[PDB]
Amino acid sequence: ENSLEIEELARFAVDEHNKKENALLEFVRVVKAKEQMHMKERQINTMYYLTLEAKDGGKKKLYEAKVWVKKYLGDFWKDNFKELQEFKPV
Amino acid sequence: ENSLEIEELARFAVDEHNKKENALLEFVRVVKAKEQMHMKERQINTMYYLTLEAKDGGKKKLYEAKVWVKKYLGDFWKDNFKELQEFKPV
Amino acid sequence: MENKIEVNSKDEMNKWFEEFKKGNGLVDTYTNSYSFCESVPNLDRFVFQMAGATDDAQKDSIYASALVEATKFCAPIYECAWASSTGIVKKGLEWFEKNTGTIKSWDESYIELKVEVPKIEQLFNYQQAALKWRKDIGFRVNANTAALSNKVLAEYKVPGEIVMSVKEMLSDMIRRRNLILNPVSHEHVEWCREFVKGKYIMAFNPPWGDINKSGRSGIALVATGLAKLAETEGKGVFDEAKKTVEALNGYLDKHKDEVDKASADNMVTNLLKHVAKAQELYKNSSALRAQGAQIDTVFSSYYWLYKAGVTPETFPTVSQFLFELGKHPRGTKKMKKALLSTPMKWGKKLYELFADDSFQQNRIYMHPAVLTAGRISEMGVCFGTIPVANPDDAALGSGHTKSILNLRTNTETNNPCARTIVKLFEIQKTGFNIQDMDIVASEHLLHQSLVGKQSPFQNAYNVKGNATSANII
Amino acid sequence: MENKIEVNSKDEMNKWFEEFKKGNGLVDTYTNSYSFCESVPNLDRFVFQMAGATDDAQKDSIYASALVEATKFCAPIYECAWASSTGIVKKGLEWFEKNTGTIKSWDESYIELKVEVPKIEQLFNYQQAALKWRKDIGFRVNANTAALSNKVLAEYKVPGEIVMSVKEMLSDMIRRRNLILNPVSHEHVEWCREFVKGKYIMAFNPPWGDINKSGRSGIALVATGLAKLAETEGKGVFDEAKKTVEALNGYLDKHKDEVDKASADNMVTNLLKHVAKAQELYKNSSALRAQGAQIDTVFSSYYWLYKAGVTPETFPTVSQFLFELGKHPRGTKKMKKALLSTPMKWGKKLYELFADDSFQQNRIYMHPAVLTAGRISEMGVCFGTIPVANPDDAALGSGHTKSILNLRTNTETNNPCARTIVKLFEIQKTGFNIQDMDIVASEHLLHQSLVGKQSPFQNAYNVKGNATSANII
């Protein structure tokens, strides 16, 4: 359900940070997560606060990430959108 | 051709006097007449002063008549109008 | 000859009028617009003439003569002049070429409408086309040439001496309108009238019985009621009523805990059905198409000019014709004779447009763009009053029916208009049996006077209310 | 689900809108009507993307995305809401059944019009029908929902930074309009243009050769000349083609003192026949039949709704569809997939109405009532901007082309409209070969802005003047 999903967002977040700042962070594993969802019939808005582990050359480091997800369950097209809104080390 | 034309107006003069003023005077013949006409393209106004002889039971006596004639030479209807304005003995 | 009323703007017009007025000595003592009427027409003798008359020809003659004498000198000179002004002539005749499409509904359907009854959309199209026609050529110069959107007057002052004669007319008009019905009871009408104002509760307990009770024909009483009300109080009722149900269904939502949600769900549907059927009944009502059959004088005149193939150059002869026609009473016979024989070809064509006997039903239903001999008088007031080829001749006088509207309707002069109309009516009454006539000129003129017309050039279609519901005081 | 926009009157509308505005926070900083557009869309990246793009699919994708982002948040909410309001939906859909007859000209010829070029009378019938449709259901609530009968702009105010880019567009528009007009020689056209301005005498002995000489076309060059002049410069010439004729009939037949009246009397016929024929040529001129193909968005939309068998109850699903379609750029393929796969009965029917490949000639000529995939966007702006089932979702943004017309055209904001159009145009230019396209959307939007459209719901057919003859400053 949820635990089966976060790790994807974590990898996404790292992969996004790799591009945003031109680096070679390798995702390790996730440790903390804090979801906050707002559903309104068709319109869904989920904000995720992530705390994850990532490698930088070899040493394992902690990272406080933050991701926005906007969804819209449509009759013809279900829309999904992700946006790493913030990514900082712990 | 006036002499061939005018007198008809006299006959009219008595015939009205017979009716409007309640009498039955009989026309004999006319001797004097004085026309005065004013034309304005389509609009014509002729005033006639006639002096005529008429029988009243038998004796023939003179009468000073007066006739107004208003004409309007139209393209579709030529209009004529007569009106005994005065009829007195002489 | 050629149109000697050189005007294209109000500026030229006013000057022309002031120029004409000083040399002729017009007055408006007795008339809403300046005219030659210096004394209220006395039509007394024609009554006694009509009484003494025996044969019908003489009676018709007498009536015609009376009407001419009435309308002879009381024509609205300013507006009449503007109506036949070179500018308005050109623009008015032009407009038809540039807008043949919008009017195809009745224009190209002409030959059939001569005999058959028009359909509502044709009337609507006609009226719309007229209202646009007025706008497109900038016809309005003052109030006497405007399009009225106001409401019919309920209070009409006439001297006591003729009151009984007026109420008598209305009483005969009302009787005619009742022929629209072929009669549904009045209580239903009161019920609807008070119902629509915002009283849904009534729906629960109709005094007659149940909401669905039917009449004769066996159609919903509600439908006939609203249908009736719309005629007497405008198109709006179908919204103000349909509205009054929303408050019900609303009220049926609160008490959905108390009252059923099955046989009550159908009350709204039922009533909405009755509103729909009522709309459908009102759509085809005689009252509406009769209301719509009302003729727009100047528009129909210019339409007929256009149809006759008259140009801004041949128009003076037409004006001269109408003048000579209105100047002195001359029968349909003489008119038809003179129409053909003229060298001008329009005279020949225009005659072909007539459809007098052709109609079968009540003539009131004939489409307002259909020319007939009797309707020629509609042109006469536009062009005939003043012969454009020689305007001074207008002083001679040329009477056409609707010129009676130029007379004053106010207490200052003791309403000469009303007096005249009444007199004519009483003449026709002395001469003929009114009941047996399709159209009574005087009644129609009164009906037009009652919606507050004061010039024959006003469009009184957008006026609102039932004119026969007026009060005489 | 159900239409959450219960409105039947302007007051109710205004209440609903005022209610909607506060809860959503609309603005009109950049738009003529209130909208969600709080920032002029920056389409810079799409250019560099289009440059970097290689395959065509990605270019089309980029363009679509750009256009969406442009139109995403700048929809005129008031008018859009009014357009999909229960009342206007009801009346608008109803109107087609009540008037199926009047529109048969193009309605029943649909399947033919998918492939064939429409005839002028079909276009005329369509436009008139549109104007009637607008009139009959009381569509007009404000200027942004009015029908323009006004005038094309001669001066078009734009920021300096893009002037040359706009002038470039017009140069490409002018170029196109000239291919519609072609090819009869120019000297003849000058002959006419200078002739009407007041030098008739040449007519006696025209310099090109003989008055009746025919060229490759089987008819007198005069007719083609007049037709040309009329095409390039409006109907008015045909009026001067009667005023300027006074010298014809006059100098030939009337002036017995100057010119002959035997071999010259027939010369009057000579040119006037060509004037008549010139009107006949102008009526069917490519310019006019192209001009008449101009589309009325809302009318065609509702027509397509009617043809699709949409009811006021199935309408919300259509609105939801168009919304979801406008929400995020998604190709025609997916569009058709979604059209077919839906449970709704309209989708397949609506799909069957497409006529993209069917057409043969230049798309500019396609009858305005023919649906095509590309033309879905015409519906999108009426129904798609606000999903009636859940209007609050409108804040998400749903872009459809013509919403660009909602943008402001004044210097205070530096004409974001012009900037946008130019941007899209340059994107299209970077991505594709403009010359090889039948219709350039941005150019069309500009041309619409040039005739002074300020909302996609205005009918700009009765506008007068040539929009490409404007000056950019």
Residue numbers in the entry:
A (entry chain E), B (entry chain F): 32 to 121
C (entry chain B), D (entry chain A): 1 to 182, 192 to 482
Authors' own words:
CCHFV is classified within the Nairoviridae family of the order Bunyavirales. Its genome comprises three negative sense RNA segments named small (S), medium (M) and large (L), which respectively encode the nucleoprotein (NP), that encapsidates each RNA segment; the glycoprotein precursor, which is post-translationally cleaved to yield envelope glycoproteins Gn and Gc; and the L protein that contains both RNA-dependent RNA polymerase (RdRp) and OTU-like modules, with the latter performing immunomodulatory roles. The RdRp and NP associate with the segments forming ribonucleoproteins (RNPs) that act as templates for all viral RNA synthesis activities. Affimer affinity reagents are a class of non-antibody binding proteins based on a phytocystatin consensus sequence that scaffolds two variable peptide regions that represent target recognition sites. We describe the selection and characterization of a high affinity non-antibody binding protein, Affimer-NP, that specifically recognises the CCHFV nucleocapsid protein (NP).
To further characterize the interaction between Affimer-NP and CCHFV NP and determine the molecular basis for the interference of Affimer-NP with CCHFV NP RNA-binding and gene expression functions, we solved the high-resolution crystal structure of the complex. Two Affimer-NP/CCHFV NP complexes were elucidated per asymmetric unit. The structure shows the variable loops of Affimer-NP bound to the globular domain of CCHFV NP, mainly interacting with the residues Q329, F330, F332, E333, K336, R339, K343, A347, T351, N399, D402 and L405. As previously published structures show, CCHFV NP contains two major domains: a globular core and an extended arm. Although no crystal structure of CCHFV NP in complex with RNA has been solved to date, analysis of its electrostatic surface potential reveals a continuous positively charged region, likely the binding site for RNA, comprising residues R45, K72, S149, H197, K222, R225, K237, Q303, K336, R339, K342, K343, K345, R372, and K462 (highlighted in blue in Fig 4A–4C). CCHFV NP exists as a monomer in the absence of RNA, but different oligomeric forms have been described when bound to RNA of the expression host. The interaction between monomers involves residues 320–354 within the head domain of one molecule and residues 210–219 and 260–272 of the arm of the adjacent molecule (highlighted in pink in Fig 4A–4C). The residues of the globular domain that interact with the variable loops of Affimer-NP all lie between NP residues 320–354, suggesting a potential interference of Affimer-NP in CCHFV NP oligomerization. As both oligomerization and RNA-binding are required for assembly of functional CCHFV RNPs, the location of the Affimer-NP binding site also offers a likely explanation for its ability to disrupt CCHFV mini-genome activity. The specificity of Affimer-NP for CCHFV NP, showing no cross-reactivity with HAZV NP, may also be explained by this crystal structure.
